[PDB]
Amino acid sequence: GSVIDPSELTFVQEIGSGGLVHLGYWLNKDKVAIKTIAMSEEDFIEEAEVMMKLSHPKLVQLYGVCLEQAPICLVFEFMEHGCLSDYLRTQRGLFAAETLLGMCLDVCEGMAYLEEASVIHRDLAARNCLVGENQVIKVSDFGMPVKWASPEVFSFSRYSSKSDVWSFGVLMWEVFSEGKIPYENRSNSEVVEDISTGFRLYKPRLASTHVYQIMNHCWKERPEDRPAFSRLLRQLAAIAASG
Amino acid sequence: GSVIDPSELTFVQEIGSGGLVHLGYWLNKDKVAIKTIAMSEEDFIEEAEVMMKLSHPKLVQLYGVCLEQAPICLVFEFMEHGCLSDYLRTQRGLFAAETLLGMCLDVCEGMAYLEEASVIHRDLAARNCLVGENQVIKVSDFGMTRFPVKWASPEVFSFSRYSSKSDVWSFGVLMWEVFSEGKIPYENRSNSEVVEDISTGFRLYKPRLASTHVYQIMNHCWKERPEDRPAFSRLLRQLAAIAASG
Ligand SMILES: CN(C)Cc1ccc([C@H]2C[C@@H]2C(=O)Nc2nc3ccc(-c4cn[nH]c4)cc3s2)cc1
Ligand SMILES: CN(C)Cc1ccc([C@H]2C[C@@H]2C(=O)Nc2nc3ccc(-c4cn[nH]c4)cc3s2)cc1
């Protein structure tokens, strides 16, 4: 991908904590979000290298990397509405169910591509999705939190695209609940035992029974019983089409 | 990339021919341009494969490939204003100079990325760029790693020698198209006339809407020797400075 010179970046305002994130411009033209880098530089950079070779409409894009001056940073396209979790909260009460479903559809399209690419996200959550023009949703940080973790993950550290699917289920809950916090006020140990016991998140009122069904498919205890993103995509679309 | 089942595509209206292109939807949801494939299927597909691993905000994207039934098709994101050449022609008279310069920047950003990846476009012209929301421009048809003299550098029309530097020559002509609002380059001229004019150092006149600064950059792109043309990476900074300076 393209190397970007420090001189070409305008840092207009912070909007992120972690490294940090700024709203800015590149070449005084393109609106961008700039991510400044503990964690090795080479890993931070390789993460960008991975994402710059994964092109999908529902996956965020970089303009490039700025390695000249410390701290180094990555330059992403600016997303007009920012993080999905925030957007859900601020726009709470304005969402039709069809729209919320559309959002899950976007993410699932992104993830089905990643799945195909043999890429495991490991941290899929609304906070790791972005909201752009016309409320299109993109997945972010896909080139590398018990509440989004599958049972085999928090128990055996066994990641797969199937563990990502679990996380996607929780993302769906976040979306349909208009940005509520999952297992709020529950400790990590409580989440683990509760889920191992069979507990699942409740159906948010804007989620039809059809939507909740799919959520529960994502939350199947055995990875092999969860649908791959590619099949999950068609399940979600079917719900939309049936009205 | 993702495989797309034929059942998932709705074909609304034909928007282009050349395979055919249709406005459509995938999953009754995402607005898409579907490109239906004589030419090799394996090449048609590899083209998509190349494009799916090149992610840049100024390069067009695919939702996936639909292989299951012939004629097979590629499924691109829909670009609301379509082909840049067409858009320029239909909206001729309405563009501000700043808008036209912004369009060249968009393309140059995409090309710098391809350049860095050692991807040689070979057919960089307005008709091979697309205009999306907010009039962003994306480069298209950059996946073919394996006629049109009007976009051809001398080393191309003489020796069929392609490189990022011949792409840059082509880009210069693209700039001309943009600032001329979709006019035909070398309109009254035969191929041999073009070869002669270029070979003797002559270049496309400066369009009314191009400033002298814009025209300077066109001319850098039209250096006789490829080694004298700036890389897309450097061209970018030249273009940005002109927007800045006003
Ligand atoms: C009021 N309007 C017109 C101006 C305005 C100002 C600020 C914002 C911020 C919510 C917008 C935002 O946060 N955009 C972002 N885009 C990205 C893109 C990528 C990344 C990113 C990718 N990996 N790491 C970070 C973060 C952001 S935040 C929106 C609108
Ligand atoms: C007016 N509205 C309601 C209908 C309508 C009809 C036609 C158009 C055409 C300008 C639109 C257009 O042609 N869009 C296109 N998008 C793409 C995207 C990718 C590709 C492509 C990439 N490789 N090969 C083809 C071609 C097109 S044409 C817009 C709106």
Swiss-Prot record, chain A:
Residues 9-239 form the Protein kinase domain. ATP binds at I15, G16, S17, G18, G19, L20, V21, K35. It is found in: Cytoplasm; Nucleus. T-cell lines and natural killer cell lines. It comes from the Eukaryota. The modification Phosphoserine is found at S189. The active site is at D123. Induction: Through a myriad of surface receptors including the TCR/CD3 signaling complex, coreceptors, or chemokine receptors. Ubiquitinated. Homooligomerizes; this association negatively regulates kinase activity. Interacts with PPIA/CYPA; this interaction regulates TCR signal strength via a proline-directed conformational switch in ITK. Interacts with THEMIS. Interacts with FASLG. Interacts with VAV1; this interaction is important for VAV1 localization and TCR-induced actin polarization. Interacts with TBX21. Belongs to the protein kinase superfamily. Tyr protein kinase family. TEC subfamily. It is linked to Lymphoproliferative syndrome 1: A rare immunodeficiency characterized by extreme susceptibility to infection with Epstein-Barr virus (EBV). Inadequate immune response to EBV can have a fatal outcome. Clinical features include splenomegaly, lymphadenopathy, anemia, thrombocytopenia, pancytopenia, recurrent infections. There is an increased risk for lymphoma. The N-terminal PH domain allows ITK to be recruited to the plasma membrane by an activated PI3 kinase. This domain also contains a proline-rich region (PRR). The adjoining domain is a SH3 domain, which binds to PRR (from itself or from other proteins). Next, a SH2 domain is required for binding tyrosine-phosphorylated substrates. In the C-terminal region, the kinase domain is required for tyrosine phosphorylation. Tyrosine kinase that plays an essential role in regulation of the adaptive immune response. Regulates the development, function and differentiation of conventional T-cells and nonconventional NKT-cells. When antigen presenting cells (APC) activate T-cell receptor (TCR), a series of phosphorylation lead to the recruitment of ITK to the cell membrane, in the vicinity of the stimulated TCR receptor, where it is phosphorylated by LCK. Phosphorylation leads to ITK autophosphorylation and full activation. This is Tyrosine-protein kinase ITK/TSK. The chain holds residues 357 to 619 of 620 of the full protein.
